[PDB]
């Protein structure tokens, strides 16, 4: 029933006194977000997770770079099994 949530502070956001907690997986994610804001008391807050993204081959390399590029570079990964 329990999943352990690590709350990792990025990009100048404050570090929390308790970085991890166990939470029942049936609650809505809002619970987690509201809980952050309660502890931070910060107007702005972004909450995001890493993810993979498989672009359509018909997509122009520029539009990709605009979205997932920096410094005139994009890092594209490839695999043969997954």
């Amino acid at each position: 029933q329990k999943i352990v949530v690590h709350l990792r502070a990025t990009g100048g956001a404050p570090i929390l006194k308790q970085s991890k907690f166990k939470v029942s997986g049936s609650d809505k994610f809002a619970n987690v977000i509201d809980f952050l804001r309660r502890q931070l008391h910060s107007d702005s807050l972004f909450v995001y997770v890493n993810s993979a993204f498989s672009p359509n081959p018909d997509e122009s390399v520029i539009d990709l770079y605009n979205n997932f590029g920096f410094d005139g570079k994009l890092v594209v990964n490839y695999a043969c099994s997954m």
């Binding site: 949530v5 308790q18 907690f21 166990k22 939470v23 609650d27 619970n31 987690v32 809980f35």
Partner: peptide, 5 residues
Amino acid sequence: IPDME
């Protein structure tokens, strides 16, 4: 062992 809520 930490427990949220």
